[PDB]
Design a protein around this ligand. Structure first.
Ligand code: HEA
Ligand SMILES: CCCCC/C=C\C/C=C/C/C=C\C/C=C\CCCC(=O)O[C@H](COC(=O)CCCCCCCCCCCCCCCCC)COP(=O)(O)OCCN
Ligand SMILES: CCCCCCCCCCO[C@@H]1O[C@H](CO)[C@@H](O[C@H]2O[C@H](CO)[C@@H](O)[C@H](O)[C@H]2O)[C@H](O)[C@H]1O
Ligand code: CUA
Ligand SMILES: [O-][O-]
Ligand SMILES: [Cu+2]
Ligand SMILES: [Mg+2]
Ligand code: NA
Ligand code: NA
Ligand SMILES: [Zn+2]
Lengths: 105, 98, 227, 514, 104, 49, 79, 58, 73, 259, 46, 84, 43, 144
């Protein structure tokens, strides 16, 4: 077994690969949401930057949805993650699901 | 205490039994009687999956002794990857019509 | 006998039937513990949006759920087997009474001293006296002394029957060619009913057992009058 | 064309469809028989006649539900449809023998319906014990027709067992070990081994009954030195494995349903599930005399049978906890099939626990041959086996047919059935504790209230069964063709589309050894 | 013997296959009005075995005493299915009841 | 767009429960079913001998 | 002489629920005893205990069947 | 005896679309027809015997 | 305007299960005594109090006077 | 065109005819037992033979003539025959159970002894000893036939198989004769019951096994078997061995120990 | 060869939903009716 | 055991033939002689109408209903004794 | 599971027809026999 | 799309919480302005309007998380319909009482029950807990 830190570092490295392809982006995210955790902001940051290298705006918004979804009834987790991602969201021009009205049922 | 009169498979085997027999002698397995051995499964060294048609179902036992098999259609053309472990598979022509 | 809307066992009339009530209370408490634990755990599994869908390791939690059930099973088996052996122990009866199943009635033989025997047939509904019980009364009751250990021997002269009296904790199959033994001891005087408990054809539902438990001195007079 | 396809089949899918149709029709027959029973009991007094015609109905109810409904649907229907598809086999090992296992059942059922039409019927109980079933107390052809019906169903299932075992051992892809086959495959294989070993013994025992009835043998007749209790040994040596046979394929289906609708790729604790089913199949051979605790056996024998019977709770608990551990962390989809499977888990548990109460020979003296046993076995058969069948049917009906069910209707169907079966059998515990015997057409007055309530329950289950017919009709009437199915990576049976073509796996799957 | 004792024995053991009154229809077995002083197998329009037809004894107290003890011993081939009544005294009472009842 | 449940769900629930209750109360009480309830606290015992 | 007889005592040779053989053994013991006594000109009343035990335990129809069979020469047990 | 299996292999592999139970020639057809008539006639006779045995007429 | 604190983000399902599984036990054991104290213990006491001074002869004399027996008027 | 090695069987009528013959035989035993008539029964035995003939004929066409029995198909048939024999063993086990139950606890109706009063058992050292030596010798001669066949020797395979069949026939006539001479019958209580039903079912299985050997003998005369591929012959030898072992258990249990 | 696909892999036609209704009705309705008619057959016997 | 035997340096048919003719058939010939000596008609038992034998609870479905299928008049009495 | 639109949609009224017919096929024949019980019961 | 009949073998679209990035894009065939928008997507996302962003999201995915997770009113239909069918069952139970069942036995008449209850009490049926235990023999009434 590895530390939390080592798990997070491996995932950050995974998404930071410069030439990550779309298959790998999908596989990484669909794998990661199978775990009992909400991913650290530094992992989501690396995955959003991969979406940018892949010219895939829609998947960036979807990744933010799935973070909110992984937190279940712990409603304090997603506002904290968004806060921490703000500088990246601004740099990359990523609108949150809320800013797009995609949180309305 | 002995003489002959009993035909051999070589003389008398026919149909698919004979095709399996002749192919076994040449080290060939057109009717999928043996398990193929995996390659390293990389993009450069994909598992080669013979098919007589344009797609075939692959089962991937991603780690040895997994009881769960991951199944998917492999299509003709560029190598595809197991959705669980990422190992690469590529469809190749049957030969199989022999 | 059973009474309307009854939930559990007929009141015990013998110390062994008392033992069985407490043992059933002990077992049913366990059944309720396990069934409610399962229902609670199911609810728990189904009431959260949190997920974990990746592979889960099965070698730790599996010990508990193998070993805790084993322990529970011994906790049931120990008092269950105590009672089984209690019911089998040597007793020394003061009387032996035989019953033979027939299609569809019981005969009784009391042959320790005299050749006493008679038949015992269900009272048809149209002949019940006022206040008597439908399907349960008979013309000739099985009169027996109370507070005495009695050896009951059970057989059949035709098909299988089964001689039962729930109050006393008794049920002994009646098998032609075979002589099965059970022991009966009532703590109280009274009337105690049972019903044929092996499918025996057309009138299986209609060949009940009625014991009449009375002091030895009354049993004697009644026996003499039955000769 | 029609005759070649449907009477001369050598195809596992069409033969499985035949079994499903046969089992569905038999289920209607079983249901009608169950309503006639509960109508007779639904008020005090005699409705039909005496115990002869009443027990002809009770005996047929049981043979029909067991031999013509549950086994054909689970093993012939889901087994044939699913087992080859789940191991990527092109068909069963013996595709023409498979067709004979099917075609033996209509004639077996005809013999059963002949037994009830001639003389006064075989009012014997489904255990068929002599001397009641012998030639003096049941003179004439009924019981011999019943024996023959069991011989054909027996042959059908023995040859089906040989076919499934040989198919599951010999026809996997060559890299796939037995520890890579799905739990439903395991469950059918283990059921097959139980059939293979237990039905010939039943066959020997009912042949001895036939020869006692017609050739003047005396296996079971004390006058010639025979023993009625020898018949019960032979019967129950089959008859306990028989109840595991009725549930094991249900356990397999439940592991698939619970896994699928939890959004998991696999059941929790796969090797524990295989171990538990093998442990249950083995232990199910050494416990039969718990059906004979009042016959007059020695005390040490009763102590052994008590203890050996309870042990089966341990591997069964491992399966129930492993299903809960499968739900744990799932993305729960509340489909009708999942609702069947959740009801199965709780209700089978309740029925298995009252079986453990019955395992104690001391208490069983007072519960044997009373409604408490009837409550026990309907919780594990009319809820357990039946719920797993309905869950499997709703789950796989779009694979077999190519069409989807209306899920709202199917949920409505589950709710009605849930209420009916519980209203029917729950009160039967009170009736058994308080002494009401089995196989009675009438009861002392005190037992009225629970009999009344239980019969009302049976009518609610009838309404469910009628509704089920309508739901299948609506599906075929509307023709919503399946577009996408999820989780095909871990559910190979779906990967050839809905319905799959007549021939599948003409080119086998490719699986590396690695 | 005792007539009403014999009435009870007849109700419990025979009434289901026999009727006693002048009139009363044949059931599994023949009607019994006029039984005594008379030959066997003679009740109008009942199908006897040849054993019962051709038995050649006259029913009276004496011959009914032997027959009721063991019917198929006395009439081998009989179709009457009834084991028999062991007690002399119960046979006496059943006969005294049948003596009265089968004749008004 | 509202679905079938949106449009009719309240009415199916209200009417179904009303119907179910009325017909079961009616069947249980109005047509002579013998429930054989307990005599305890209800029956006055009477001389039978 | 040892009356006071309430019923047949517990017999450790037959300690189980099936008592068929207890009835049979006592029945044979009574008849063997009595034949041997008559043969050897002796008593017969020494056989009484066995008669009391079989009479207590044995169904009346068994006894009476076995009695008919001894008088017939078809009793299968050795006496 | 002479080994004539090659001739039979040729006959049973001939590409005429006949199922194996008819592939031997006209004799297969006759036997098949005899078997199917006895099974079907027999099953009808068994149904007749059922209806007969189902009522009493004595 | 003040940052949000970093919350717990890992093993949320496991934390939930560890909290509630205690309660599952307590409710099911929980019922614990209920059957035990409300049903079993009440039963033991009912039989002990019934028989503590029970008089089988007076019980029989009451039944005999009520006319219930065939053997005893 | 398939790229697996398994056999897709042509649609066939024999399963339905086999099923129907089972209806006719069973309803035929019913009519024979209760309605004094042998007609249904003889139709069913007729259709049952016709069905077996054409079914196994077709298996021969598929394998010898068409080449469908690849090693994977042949292995499946191995399993099928082993499982079928296992089910026949459990069938006999029921009769042995019946035999031991009755003989270990003889009832009073029997005289409380085994063999029952009035029963004079056969002498296990007379014809039963001979039957034993006949089936054992036939296990030796069938093994000779097997080795001759693997070594390619037509003539000695046929001589050895011929001897094996002759011994099975000899056993069958010895047994028929012992049945006629036996002073007890099937109606002689539970001794006659267990004795004739257990040895009678065994007799039937010897007739079946001998017929299978006769089929192998005729297929061998026609050169069907190669020195490496002859599964019909091995299935008939396994069945023959099963038949020999059941006799050994009968001979030890019923003739020797139960005499 | 045989027809393949939804509604073609079954021994009954689903071409017309009302014909289908009639067939299903006779199918399931005959199995459900049969035990009532047999009980009646037995009662009519005596 | 081994018996007294020997072989595994060669070819099987020849050995199994040696066993067939040198051991198996000689054994059958000895038991055949042994039977064709220690046989001859055992005298017929002597009739006792025992109730556990000659059971008739239903007539057999052949003959007059009272004869067993391999009935032998010399040694198989009917329920009423030996016949003809 | 997703599906294509119904090829031959079955409207509320057609469902009511299918439901009704199905219930009647079960209830009428049984209802007929159970209604006439006492007629047969005349031995 | 002339993808229809070999289609079951092709990768496909699913909306599921636990599979956020499906194997294919929801929209298969793009219009000209959607193709223009895919090309614009290769430049800075800050230059995209909100409407453009929602459009790119809808080319890729069919429903948002909030849509695919919404709760529904289905349980009302299912519970109310189950109650309707269970209420219909009571109609059948009425018809059966009216036309199948005859007379209940005479032993359920009020007078029989009053006398049978006394006789049960006189024999002390279940005098420990079950029945006569509930009778006060001193005051000659049911216990309160
Ligand atoms: C599906 C069919 C089925 C199944 C699976 C079972 C399973 C079991 N049954 Fe049952 N049974 C029948 C169907 C079946 N039964 C039928 C038809 C009859 C009557 C036959 C006739 O007379 O007609 C019958 C009769 C029968 C009898 C005879 C009673 C009598 O006639 O007097 C007994 C007695 O021991 C018995 C016991 C058991 C037990 C111990 C199990 C066990 O397998 C149950 C094990 C399961 C559990 C215990 C629940 C899950 C476990 C856990 C959650 C772990 C924790 C539990 C504990 C620590 C206790 N059954
Ligand atoms: C020569 C040795 C070879 C044995 C074959 C001989 C011919 C008869 C048929 C054999 C079938 C096998 C066993 C059936 C049971 C009974 C026959 C037992 C063997 C036998 O042939 O017993 C004879 C009596 O046979 C009788 O009743 C004969 C009555 C025949 C009635 C057949 C009953 C059919 C039984 C149904 C079988 C069902 C099979 C179940 C299938 C398994 C399902 C999975 C013995 O003759 P006996 O005069 O009584 O005594 C000799 C005194 N001199
Ligand atoms: C155990 C499960 C079965 C539950 C069945 C309960 C459902 C009842 C459905 C209706 O059945 C019908 O009822 C009618 C009466 O209501 C019957 O007509 C009968 O009664 C009519 C009026 O009294 C007469 O007009 C008819 O001629 C006479 O047959 C009719 O035959 C019968 O089909
Ligand atoms: Cu006697 Cu049931
Ligand atoms: O059977 O349990
Ligand atoms: Cu069991
Ligand atoms: Mg019983
Ligand atoms: Na009733
Ligand atoms: Na070989
Ligand atoms: Zn993989």
């Amino acid at each position: 077994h590895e530390t939390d830190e080592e798990f997070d570092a491996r995932w950050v490295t995974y998404f930071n690969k410069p030439d990550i392809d779309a298959w790998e982006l999908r596989k990484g995210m669909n794998t990661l949401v199978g775990y009992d955790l909400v991913p650290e902001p530094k992992i989501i940051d690396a995955a959003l930057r991969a979406c940018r290298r892949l010219n895939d705006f829609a998947s960036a918004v979807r990744i933010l949805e799935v973070v909110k979804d992984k937190a279940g009834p712990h409603k304090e987790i997603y506002p904290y993650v968004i806060q921490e991602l703000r500088p990246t969201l601004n740099e990359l021009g990523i609108s949150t699901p809320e800013e797009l009205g995609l949180d309305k049922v | 205490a002995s003489g002959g009169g009993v035909p051999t498979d070589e003389e008398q085997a026919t149909g698919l039994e004979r095709e399996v027999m002749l192919a076994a002698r040449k080290g060939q397995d057109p009717y999928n009687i043996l398990a193929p051995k995996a390659t390293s499964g990389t993009k450069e060294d994909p598992n080669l999956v013979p098919s007589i048609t344009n797609k075939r179902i692959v089962g991937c036992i991603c780690e040895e002794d997994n009881s769960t098999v991951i199944w998917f259609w492999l299509h003709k053309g560029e190598a595809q990857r197991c959705p669980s472990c990422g190992t690469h598979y590529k469809l190749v022509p049957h030969q199989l019509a022999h | 006998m059973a009474y309307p809307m009854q939930l559990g066992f007929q009141d015990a009339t013998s110390p062994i039937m008392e033992e069985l009530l407490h043992f059933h209370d002990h077992t049913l408490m366990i059944v309720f513990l396990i069934s409610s634990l399962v229902l609670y755990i199911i609810s728990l599994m189904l009431t959260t949006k949190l997920t974990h869908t990746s592979t889960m390791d099965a070698q730790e939690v599996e010990t508990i759920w193998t070993i805790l059930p084993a322990i529970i099973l011994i906790l049931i088996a120990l008092p269950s087997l105590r009672i089984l052996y209690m019911m089998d122990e040597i007793n020394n009866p003061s009387l032996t009474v035989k019953t033979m199943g027939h299609q569809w009635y019981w005969s009784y033989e009391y042959t320790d001293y005299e050749d006493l025997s008679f038949d015992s047939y269900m009272i048809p509904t149209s002949e019940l006296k006022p206040g008597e019980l439908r399907l349960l009364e008979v013309d000739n009751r099985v009169v027996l002394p109370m507070e005495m250990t009695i050896r009951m021997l059970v057989s059949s002269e035709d098909v299988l029957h089964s001689w039962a009296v729930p109050s006393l904790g008794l049920k002994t199959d009646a098998i032609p060619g075979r002589l099965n033994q059970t022991t009966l001891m009532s703590s109280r005087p009274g009337l105690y009913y049972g019903q044929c408990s092996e499918i025996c054809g057309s009138n299986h539902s209609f060949m009940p057992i009625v014991l009449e438990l009375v002091p030895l001195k009354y049993f004697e007079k009644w026996s003499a009058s039955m000769l | 064309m029609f005759i070649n396809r449907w009477l001369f089949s050598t195809n596992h899918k069409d033969i499985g469809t035949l079994y499903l149709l046969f089992g569905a029709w038999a289920g209607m027959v079983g249901t009608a028989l169950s309503l006639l029973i509960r109508a007779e009991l639904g008020q005090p007094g005699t409705l039909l006649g005496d115990d002869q015609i009443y027990n002809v109905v009770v005996t047929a109810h049981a043979f029909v539900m067991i031999f013509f409904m549950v086994m054909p649907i689970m093993i012939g229907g889901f087994g044939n449809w699913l087992v080859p598809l789940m191991i990527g086999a092109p068909d069963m090992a013996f595709p023409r023998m498979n067709n004979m296992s099917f075609w033996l059942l209509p004639p077996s059922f005809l013999l059963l319906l002949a037994s009830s039409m001639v003389e006064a019927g075989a009012g014997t109980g489904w255990t068929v014990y002599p001397p009641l079933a012998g030639n003096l107390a049941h003179a004439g052809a009924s019981v011999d027709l019943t024996i023959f019906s069991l011989h054909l169903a027996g042959v059908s299932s023995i040859l089906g067992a040989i076919n499934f075992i040989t198919t599951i051992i010999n026809m996997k892809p060559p890299a796939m070990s037995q520890y890579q086959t799905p739990l439903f495959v395991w469950s059918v294989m283990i059921t097959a081994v139980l059939l293979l070993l237990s039905l010939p013994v039943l066959a020997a025992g009912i042949t001895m009954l036939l020869t006692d009835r017609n050739l003047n043998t005396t296996f079971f007749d004390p006058a010639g030195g025979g023993d009625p209790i020898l018949y019960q040994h032979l019967f129950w040596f089959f008859g306990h494995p028989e109840v595991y046979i009725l549930i094991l394929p249900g356990f397999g289906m439940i592991s698939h349903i619970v896994t699928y609708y939890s959004g998991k790729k696999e059941p929790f604790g796969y090797m524990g599930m295989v171990w538990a089913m093998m442990s249950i199949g083995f232990l199910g051979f050494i416990v039969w005399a718990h059906h004979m605790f009042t016959v007059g056996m020695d005390v040490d024998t009763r102590a052994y049978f008590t203890s050996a019977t309870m042990i089966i709770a341990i591997p069964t608990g491992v399966k129930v906890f492993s299903w809960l551990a499968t739900l744990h962390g799932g993305n729960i989809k509340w489909s009708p099939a999942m609702m069947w499977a959740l009801g199965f888990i709780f209700l089978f548990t309740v029925g298995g626990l009252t079986g453990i109460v019955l395992a104690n020979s001391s208490l069983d003296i007072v519960l044997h041959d009373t409604y408490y046993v009837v409550a026990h076995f309907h919780y594990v058969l009319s809820m357990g086996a039946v719920f797993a069948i309905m869950g499997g049917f709703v789950h796989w009906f779009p694979l077999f047919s190519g069409y989807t069910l209306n899920d709202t209707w199917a949920k409505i169907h589950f709710a009605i059935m849930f209420v009916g079966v519980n209203m029917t059998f729950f009160p039967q515990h009170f009736l058994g504790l308080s002494g009401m015997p089995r196989r009675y057409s009438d009861y002392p007055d005190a037992y009225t209230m629970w009999n009344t309530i239980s019969s009302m329950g049976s009518f609610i289950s009838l309404t469910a069964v009628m509704l089920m017919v309508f739901i299948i009709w609506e599906a075929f009437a509307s023709k919503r063709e399946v577009l996408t199915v999820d989780l095909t990576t871990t559910n190979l049976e779906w990967l050839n589309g809905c319905p799959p073509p007549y021939h599948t796996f003409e080119e086998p799957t490719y699986v590396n050894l690695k | 013997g005792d007539v009403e004792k014999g009435k009870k024995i007849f109700v419990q053991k025979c009434a289901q296959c026999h009727t006693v009154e002048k009139g009363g229809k044949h059931k599994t077995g023949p009607n019994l009005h006029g039984l005594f002083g008379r030959k066997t197998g003679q009740a109008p329009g009942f199908t006897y075995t040849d054993a019962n037809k051709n038995k050649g004894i006259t029913w009276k107290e004496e011959t009914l005493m032997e027959y009721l003890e063991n019917p198929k011993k006395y009439i081998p081939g009989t179709k009457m299915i009834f084991a028999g009544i062991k007690k002399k005294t119960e046979r006496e009472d059943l006969i005294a009841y049948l003596k009265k009842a089968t004749n008004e | 767009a509202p679905d079938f449940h949106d449009k009719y769900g309240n009415a199916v629930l209200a009417s179904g429960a009303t119907f179910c209750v009325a017909v079961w109360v009616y069947m249980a009480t109005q047509i002579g079913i013998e429930w054989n309830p307990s005599p305890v606290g209800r029956v006055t015992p009477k001389e039978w001998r | 002489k040892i009356k006071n007889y309430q019923t047949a005592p517990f017999d450790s040779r037959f300690p189980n629920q099936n008592q068929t053989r207890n009835c049979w053994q006592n029945y044979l013991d009574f008849h063997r005893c009595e034949k041997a006594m008559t043969a050897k000109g002796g008593d017969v009343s020494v056989c009484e205990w066995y008669r009391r035990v079989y009479k207590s335990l044995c169904p009346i129809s068994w006894v009476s069947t076995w009695d008919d069979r001894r008088a017939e020469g078809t009793f299968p047990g050795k006496i | 005896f002479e080994n004539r299996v090659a001739e039979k292999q040729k006959l049973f592999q001939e590409d005429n679309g006949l199922p194996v139970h008819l592939k031997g020639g006209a004799t297969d057809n006759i036997l098949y027809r005899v078997t199917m008539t006895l099974c079907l006639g027999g099953t009808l006779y068994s149904l007749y015997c059922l209806g007969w045995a189902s009522f009493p007429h004595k | 305007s003040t940052a949000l604190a970093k919350p717990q983000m890992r093993g949320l399902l496991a934390r939930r299960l560890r909290f509630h599984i205690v309660g599952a036990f307590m409710v099911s054991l929980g019922f614990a005594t209920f059957y035990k104290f409300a049903v079993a213990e009440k039963r033991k006491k009912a039989y002990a109090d019934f028989y503590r001074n029970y008089d089988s002869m007076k019980d029989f004399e009451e039944m005999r006077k009520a006319g219930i027996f065939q053997s005893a008027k | 065109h398939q790229t697996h090695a398994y056999h897709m069987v042509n649609p066939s009528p024999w399963p339905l005819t086999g099923a129907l013959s089972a209806l006719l035989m069973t309803s035929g035993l019913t009519m024979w037992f209760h309605f004094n008539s042998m007609t249904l029964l003889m139709i069913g035995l007729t259709t049952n033979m016709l069905t077996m003939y054409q079914w196994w004929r077709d298996v021969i066409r598929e394998s010898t003539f068409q080449g469908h029995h690849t090693p994977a198909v042949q292995k499946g048939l191995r399993y099928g025959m082993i499982l079928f024999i296992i089910s026949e063993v459990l069938f006999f086990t029921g009769f042995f159970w019946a035999f031991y139950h009755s003989s270990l606890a003889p009832t009073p109706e029997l005289g409380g002894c085994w063999p029952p009063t009035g029963i004079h058992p056969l002498n296990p050292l007379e014809v039963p000893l001979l039957n034993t030596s006949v089936l054992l010798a036939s296990g030796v001669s069938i093994t000779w036939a097997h080795h001759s066949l693997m070594e390619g020797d037509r003539k000695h395979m046929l001589q050895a198989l011929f001897i094996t069949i002759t011994l099975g026939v000899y056993f069958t006539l010895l047994q028929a004769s012992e049945y006629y001479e036996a002073p007890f019958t099937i109606s002689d209580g539970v001794y006659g019951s267990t004795f004739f039903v257990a040895t009678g079912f065994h007799g039937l299985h010897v007739i079946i096994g001998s017929t299978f050997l006769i089929v192998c003998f005729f297929r061998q005369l026609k050169f069907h078997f190669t020195s490496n591929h002859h599964f019909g012959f091995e299935a008939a030898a396994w069945y023959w061995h099963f038949v020999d072992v059941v006799w050994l258990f009968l001979y030890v249990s019923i003739y020797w120990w139960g005499s | 060869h045989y027809e393949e696909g939804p509604g073609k892999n079954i021994p009954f036609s689903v071409e017309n939903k009302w014909r289908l209704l009639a067939m299903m009705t006779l199918f399931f309705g005959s199995g459900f009716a049969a035990p009532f008619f047999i009980v009646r057959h037995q009662l009519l016997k005596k | 055991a081994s018996a007294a035997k020997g072989d595994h340096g060669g070819t099987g048919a020849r050995t199994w033939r040696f066993l067939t003719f040198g051991l198996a058939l000689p054994s059958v010939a000895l038991c055949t002689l042994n039977s064709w000596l220690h046989s001859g008609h055992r005298e017929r038992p002597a009739f006792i109408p025992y109730h556990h034998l000659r059971i008739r609870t239903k007539p057999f479905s052949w003959g007059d209903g009272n004869h067993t299928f391999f009935h032998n008049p010399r040694v198989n009495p009917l329920p009423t004794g030996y016949e003809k | 599971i997703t599906a294509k639109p119904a090829k031959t949609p079955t409207s509320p009224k057609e469902q009511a027809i299918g439901l009704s017919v199905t219930f009647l096929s079960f209830l009428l024949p049984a209802g007929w026999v159970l209604y006439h019980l006492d007629n047969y019961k005349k031995s | 799309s002339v993808v229809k009949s070999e289609d079951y073998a092709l990768p496909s679209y699913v909306d599921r919480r636990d599979y956020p990035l499906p194997d294919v894009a929801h929209v298969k065939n793009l219009s000209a302005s959607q193709k223009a928008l895919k090309e614009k997507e290769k430049a800075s996302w800050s230059s995209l309007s909100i409407d453009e962003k929602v459009e790119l999201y809808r080319l890729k995915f069919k429903e948002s998380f909030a849509e695919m997770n919404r709760s529904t009113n289905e349980w009302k239909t299912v519970v109310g319909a189950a109650m309707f069918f269970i209420g219909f069952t009571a109609l059948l139970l009425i018809w059966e009482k009216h036309y199948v069942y005859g007379p209940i036995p005479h032993t359920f008449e009020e007078e029989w029950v009053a006398k049978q209850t006394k006789r049960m009490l006189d024999m002390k049926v279940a005098p420990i807990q079950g029945f006569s235990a509930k009778w006060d023999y001193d005051k000659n009434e049911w216990k309160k």
